[PDB]
């Protein structure tokens, strides 16, 4: 159908395009973007000395060898503070639906 046809081929490999959903750089979510690299992922975690869930966060190394812990905001930032009752073991099922209980221990 027209000159633009895939009939042409040789001794090489071709990359296939993804349709119906245009992707973005690795620092975008796979659900909305594409090929979302985990290196840029903000996940729920629990601190060591405190016993409160600070919400979504990601470990990152900063200048001088010091490691930082960035954070994000979502779901009012309040439901996660109460999510500690789900990680230690509506506002009760929501804590189980918004996440897959993939909160970081210690």
């Amino acid at each position: 159908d027209g000159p633009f046809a895939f009939r042409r081929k040789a001794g090489c490999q071709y990359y296939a395009p993804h349709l119906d959903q245009t992707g973005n750089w690795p620092w975008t979510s796979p659900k909305d973007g594409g090929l979302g690299d985990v290196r840029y992922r903000y996940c729920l975690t629990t601190l060591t000395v405190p016993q409160r869930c600070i919400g979504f966060a990601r470990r990152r190394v900063g200048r001088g060898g010091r490691v930082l812990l960035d954070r994000a905001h979502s779901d009012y930032d309040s439901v996660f503070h109460h999510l500690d009752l789900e990680m230690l073991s509506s506002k009760d099922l929501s804590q189980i639906l918004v996440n897959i209980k993939s909160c970081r221990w210690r």
Partner: peptide
Amino acid sequence: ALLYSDKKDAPPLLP
């Protein structure tokens, strides 16, 4: 679902 961001979001803060 969990968030994906490169640099920073609007209100966040890091310890």
